[PDB]
Amino acid sequence: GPLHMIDYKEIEVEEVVGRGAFGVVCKAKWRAKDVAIKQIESESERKAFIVELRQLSRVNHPNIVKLYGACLNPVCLVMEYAEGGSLYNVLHGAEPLPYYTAAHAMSWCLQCSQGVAYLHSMQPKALIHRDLKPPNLLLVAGGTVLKICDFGTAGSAAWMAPEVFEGSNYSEKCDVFSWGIILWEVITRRKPFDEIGGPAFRIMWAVHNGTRPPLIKNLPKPIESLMTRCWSKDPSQRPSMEEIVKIMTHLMRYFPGADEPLQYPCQHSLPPGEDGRVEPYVDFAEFYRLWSVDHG
Numbered sequence: 001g002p003l004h005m006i007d008y009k010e011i012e013v014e015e016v017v018g019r020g021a022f023g024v025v026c027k028a029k030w031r032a033k034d035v036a037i038k039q040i041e042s043e044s045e046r047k048a049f050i051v052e053l054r055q056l057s058r059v060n061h062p063n064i065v066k067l068y069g070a071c072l073n074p075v076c077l078v079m080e081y082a083e084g085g086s087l088y089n090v091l092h093g094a095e096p097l098p099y100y101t102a103a104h105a106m107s108w109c110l111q112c113s114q115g116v117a118y119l120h121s122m123q124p125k126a127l128i129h130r131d132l133k134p135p136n137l138l139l140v141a142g143g144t145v146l147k148i149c150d151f152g153t154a155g156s157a158a159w160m161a162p163e164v165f166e167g168s169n170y171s172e173k174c175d176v177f178s179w180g181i182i183l184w185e186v187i188t189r190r191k192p193f194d195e196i197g198g199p200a201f202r203i204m205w206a207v208h209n210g211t212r213p214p215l216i217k218n219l220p221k222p223i224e225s226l227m228t229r230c231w232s233k234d235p236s237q238r239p240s241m242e243e244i245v246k247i248m249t250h251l252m253r254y255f256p257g258a259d260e261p262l263q264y265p266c267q268h269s270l271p272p273g274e275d276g277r278v279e280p281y282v283d284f285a286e287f288y289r290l291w292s293v294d295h296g
């Protein structure tokens with residue numbers, strides 16, 4: 001649809017806000033509007049650039065970053081600016097970190113699944129993101145609205161389905177695995193496979209052998225089932241994104257307050273796992289109370 005060929009002179013480039021999965025992202029102004037501009041640095045990043053330009057111009061969804069246009073002198077994309085930064089920074093960035101609730105955690109994952117389900121429903125071919133992870137998930141509207149970005153492939157071993165790095169043939173089900181890891185990550189406020197570390201191949205080996213993130217103490221059984229289904233070794237046993245959207249949509253009845261902006265401070269550090277399980281960062285006592293009222 002609407003896509004502007006942009007004269008660079010019209011872009012007032014403010015500060016560098018970070019590096020995307022490729023390129024460099026700057027806060028900028030264009031037509032008196034706040035935008036993000038993504039510029040390639042290397043000549044190698046040109047492939048990711050054409051891919052992203054093609055893919056992002058195809059897509060129109062509330063949970064996918066808006067592409068306003070492109071400049072070719074110099075080669076850069078002009079996109080929606082995400083004032084809340086990345087989910088990864090919200091979760092794991094420098095202190096002070098924001099407080100967030102079970103409702104936020106569930107809402108972010110629902111919104112991610114809605115974006116990805118839209119991708120998987122594209123005609124004539126499904127669009128696969130292939131690099132779903134909190135660095136590539138952005139927040140707007142006081143941290144309450146999530147948008148997928150970094151479509152240059154449409155650092156990442158901790159979210160990658162084992163069939164992807166096994167060089168095996170794969171499908172949209174790879175995004176489902178990634179989503180399952182993200183669900184664990186927002187609930188625990190832990191970096192997946194942080195304890196392994198090393199170089200990437202050590203994570204790949206672990207996941208390849210069936211290592212998954214530790215189970216979560218007092219996690220509601222339906223959330224646990226959904227999570228562990230998503231990270232099945234066999235991609236055909238993983239649910240479709242359409243099913244995840246439906247399940248997560250119905251679960252939100254038991255997670256009111258997702259519309260509350262991130263505004264409260266938090267002082268957060270990690271206790272190690274008591275058994276083989278970890279504590280959730282979020283609290284499920286309210287979920288269980290609301291469930292009990294509804295069911296009996």
Ligand SMILES: CN1CCN(C(=O)c2ccc(NC(=O)c3csc4c(=O)[nH]cnc34)c(-c3ccccc3)c2)CC1
Nearest residue numbers: 017018019020025036065079080081082085086149150
């Ligand atoms: C003081 N103020 C400074 C700016 N700010 C951020 O932290 C802050 C604000 C905005 C950001 N990005 C975007 O708006 C953005 C739009 S499209 C796109 C993409 O395709 N890839 C990565 N980022 C973006 C980032 C950021 C996040 C991850 C990687 C690179 C950039 C950080 C909030 C706090």
